[PDB]
Design a protein around this nucleic acid. Structure first.
Length: 76
RNA sequence: GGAUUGAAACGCCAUGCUCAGGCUGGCGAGUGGGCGCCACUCUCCAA
């Protein structure tokens, strides 16, 4: 894996003088090795329900979104 | 259309099992034993 993220550029100066930008993965300490332990077979069932946000418009109704959700889930 | 301690993340670049060594030297299938004992082509048919 990699050691660090990328920095923000300045579009103006970048083009006004052609300059390459990149991150060099293979260089020195940039390379980092990480181990992991993980599950191998899973299955679950989830129970939940909706609730109205404060910014919601007056026309919004939870049941409508719930029906949309059921449609989408059935259709995959 | 904000936010699954999440969003991105190569095990990678390459190296001869090599050089060589006798299954050899040699040993008798060899000694010896009867196919023998004995038995009618014989009775009669002109040229």
């Amino acid at each position: 894996e990699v050691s660090s993220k990328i920095p923000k550029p300045n579009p103006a100066t970048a083009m006004r003088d052609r300059k390459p930008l990149y991150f060099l993965v293979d260089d020195g300490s940039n390379r980092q090795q990480r181990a992991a332990t993980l599950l191998r077979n899973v299955d679950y069932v989830i129970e939940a329900h909706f609730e109205l946000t404060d910014k919601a418009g007056a026309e919004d109704n939870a049941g409508k979104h719930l029906d949309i959700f059921r449609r989408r889930a059935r259709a995959g």
